[PDB]
Write a protein that binds this DNA or RNA. Structure first.
Lengths: 93, 98, 107, 84, 98, 79, 106, 93
DNA sequence: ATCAATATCCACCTGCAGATACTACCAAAAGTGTATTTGGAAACTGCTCCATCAAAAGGCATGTTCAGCTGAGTCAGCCAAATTAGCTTATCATGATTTTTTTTTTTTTTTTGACACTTTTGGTAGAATGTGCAGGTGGATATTGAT
DNA sequence: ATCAATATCCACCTGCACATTCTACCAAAAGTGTCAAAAAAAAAAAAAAAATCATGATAAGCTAATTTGGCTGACTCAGCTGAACATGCCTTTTGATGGAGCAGTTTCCAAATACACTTTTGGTAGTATCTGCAGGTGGATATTGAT
């Protein structure tokens, strides 16, 4: 088995466009996207730590990274959608 | 006997291919040029059916995106005819040529 | 029986985003809040693009997204474009455009 | 098993032109048609060389696509669509 | 009386600085700017002499190269006057505007 | 001011090194434009690096680390 | 008085590399050869650099070596230049070059 | 306490031109040269490592990483000394 | 200002590839609970150094004028390379088969890291000696600009 | 070419600043002997995928030729810049004092990593189901270059 987000995309996919379809050619370009973004962020994060003699990666780093790797309007929005997710989690269970 | 004025096939032509997403370079002549060049690097190399297209999409897209960066140069000098002296610049500013 | 994804409200796999965070060892300890926030940005960005992506499919009167749209959407969005400005969409073609002098004019 | 040579010519003037439209080009010089080929030749050699280099490290004989892909990413020409 | 045909103390300056490495910027009109700017991001910001001295370098060296790239852009048009139009090009063909 | 502090006959010093032939009028601004935008871009990323480290001052690294992620590297102050 | 550095006959901190290599999280497990081979490539370049960088003081009579010494070398060397092509040396300046056309007679 | 390659830069400077020094503003320019290079060859070596599922960087990786980074001829010699440095390490107590 | 020949194209109809679902179920994966560690934070503060002056010295900026300039307007011959048809090759999409390369799993032989113990080092901080880089001063050499 | 008109490199230098020598100290570092984990190293073997091959079939490359138009070298006024230079502003740099701030450190909280155990899931797999977008066909519209 090969891991993949072909579903977390699809779920999200309907949410925005309920009755729309997504080719194999494009779901791929998308699996290649989430992934690219991940590494990109997961890496600036990783880096910040080192930049600040820290051994842990935290929502404190993933943020500064998103703000670094994501441009304008997009970013301000991620940080947001993010913060939320966290907070709601830190109050889930 | 009818024709089409100087350049009224191009403007036509362009418009044609700009809305498409199919590969131009023929698949075959390309693939050979591929195994030829990998050859003189490592003899006896096999290529995954795909991995070659990986190279074509890539190789293509590139070429397509350097013509662009070309007119923007010929055009800079009131011409509308792309020439080596052009490309060459596009590449030099692009920080490529060596 | 309750995924962290539903715990935090997202959809993308929170744990997966965590595990991978390790299997890559971008750092020694992947905190507990991070993976969430991450899977969070990724969910956003995915929804952000699929939207401009679908709409593109709506125009081109199709009901099935195919790279051309993803491209069409990614190139036609100041932001996203700069995020993907060094990425190439396989099978996406370029943007319907032409220079001006090239235009045939003057009487 | 046949000697491969001069396939940089399969990049026919036709296609070499077909691209150039998509690139938004109208009038195309003549020294051009070659100069292009020999640019593409340099492109391929820079990528293949890395692709092949990620193949040799893998103890492989088969240039996989990840190979290539990882080779484009490493060059500034990140490609989406072939796994990875 | 003796003047100078437009060229010399253009050239002997070229020749000069190209021969030098010193900064071509007063460490304040700049550093102030540098401070102006930052504020648009954060308040009561301090800058290790080390920092402002870096950007200074970077910032200049950068402008340098853009100029070379610029130059050709003009020369490309069979001139020698770095026109606004040039930059536009150069900075576009680089990636700064695409 | 504060943008105009970048003196005209001086810009020409930088223009010099680049082997700038003559020069121009509308350039000086067009230039003042670039330089500025170049800056923002760096300073921003830096200022953001600064703020991750609960500081108020912007270190040398703070910049370096920006110039790097931004493509234009800089050897010399990494110490 | 023997260190991996010593036995591998190396002048660079071949010892700390096995440290830096893991600290940077460039993995977990680090083989014992890599920490070396790395240093070597490192020592080589450093010299090969300083080298070309050295003859630069012989060219601009000064004995010591200042930035412009390095910078002048790198640029004037193919390989390096390529390798540093996107690195900027502080206090580097350019290269006495004038696209012909800019000089006198035409 | 701070670190640096400074000394090993000199110890090697003291191997090509015993009749020469190095401006402090050329030392860092040589610290950053080195510091940098490492980070390159390493990650590229790290990726190499994580591309094959292997959990360990080896001399191999460093090589297939050096070959990947340093230019044409400047790459061959590199691989050389490297090998040597190593091959001498093996047989030497 | 009409006209026919060309070609882009709005919608339509239809059939197989491609996308959608059904469904069991696996091992990897992720949740859950508990012992155990420790990362870095809240707190105290020493020592680096960043900001703000005021001094002084004058250079580098600024604002006007002057002519030589080459950038930009302008036209027009040669000739480059658009284009449109006349033929036949090399590509391709069908379709499958051959054989070799990569992937699955499994044994043991080697390599590494961590644990608690020696011993080695390269920065740290003054103090300190010595070497030469700054730059500036003497000046014929030097380029170029009009006679 | 000659000559005045205004600026560069060799050179002797020597003051001051800093590049280097030492002297000692240690806070962290590099290697050691040992032990137990695990990873690589290898290794016979199923599964997948690439190269090899036949084939009808051809639009797509080729290639000759005809020709509208961009490419290109030139005339020429003038908007534009360097150059030339003189009233004088604030940027440097010594030189400093002060106080914000980042850095060293000691302890504890809460956060996290590790093993225990349960079991939720998202992915391979044989399976069929289903639907759309591609490929043919009719012909409507807008373009186009000559009459």
């Amino acid at each position: 088995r090969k891991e993949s987000y072909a579903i977390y995309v699809y779920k999200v996919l309907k949410q925005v466009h309920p009755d729309t379809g997504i080719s194999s050619k494009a779901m791929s370009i998308m699996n290649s996207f989430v992934n690219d973004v991940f590494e990109r962020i997961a890496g600036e994060a990783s880096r910040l730590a080192h930049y600040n003699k820290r051994s842990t990666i935290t929502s404190r780093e993933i943020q500064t990274a998103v703000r670094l790797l994501l441009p304008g309007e997009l970013a301000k929005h991620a940080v947001s959608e993010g913060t939320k997710a966290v907070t709601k989690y830190t109050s889930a269970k | 006997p009818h024709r089409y004025r100087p350049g009224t096939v191009a403007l036509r032509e362009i418009r044609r291919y700009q809305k498409s997403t199919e590969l131009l370079i023929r698949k075959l002549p390309f693939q050979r040029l591929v195994r030829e060049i990998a050859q003189d690097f490592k003899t006896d190399l096999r290529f995954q059916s795909s991995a070659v297209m990986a190279l074509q999409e890539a190789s293509e897209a590139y070429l397509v995106a350097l013509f662009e960066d070309t007119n923007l140069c010929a055009i800079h000098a009131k011409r509308v005819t792309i020439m080596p002296k052009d490309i060459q610049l596009a590449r030099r500013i692009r920080g490529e040529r060596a | 029986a309750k995924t962290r994804s539903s715990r935090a409200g997202l959809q993308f796999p929170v744990g997966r985003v965590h595990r991978l965070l390790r299997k890559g060892n971008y750092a020694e300890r992947v905190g507990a809040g991070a993976p969430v926030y991450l899977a969070a940005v990724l969910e956003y960005l995915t929804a952000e693009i699929l939207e401009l992506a679908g709409n593109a499919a709506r125009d081109n009167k199709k009901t099935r997204i195919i790279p051309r749209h993803l491209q069409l959407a990614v190139r036609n969005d100041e932001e996203l474009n700069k995020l993907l400005g060094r990425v190439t969409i396989a099978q996406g073609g370029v943007l319907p455009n032409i220079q001006s002098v090239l235009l045939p004019k003057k009487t | 098993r046949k000697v491969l040579r001069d396939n940089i010519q399969g990049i026919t003037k036709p296609a070499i032109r077909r691209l150039a439209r998509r690139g938004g080009v109208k009038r195309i010089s003549g020294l051009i048609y070659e100069e292009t080929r020999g640019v593409l030749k340099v492109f391929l050699e820079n990528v293949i060389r890395d692709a092949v280099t990620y193949t040799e490290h893998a103890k492989r004989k088969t240039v996989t696509a990840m190979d290539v892909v990882y080779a484009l990413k490493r060059q500034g020409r990140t490609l989406y669509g072939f796994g990875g």
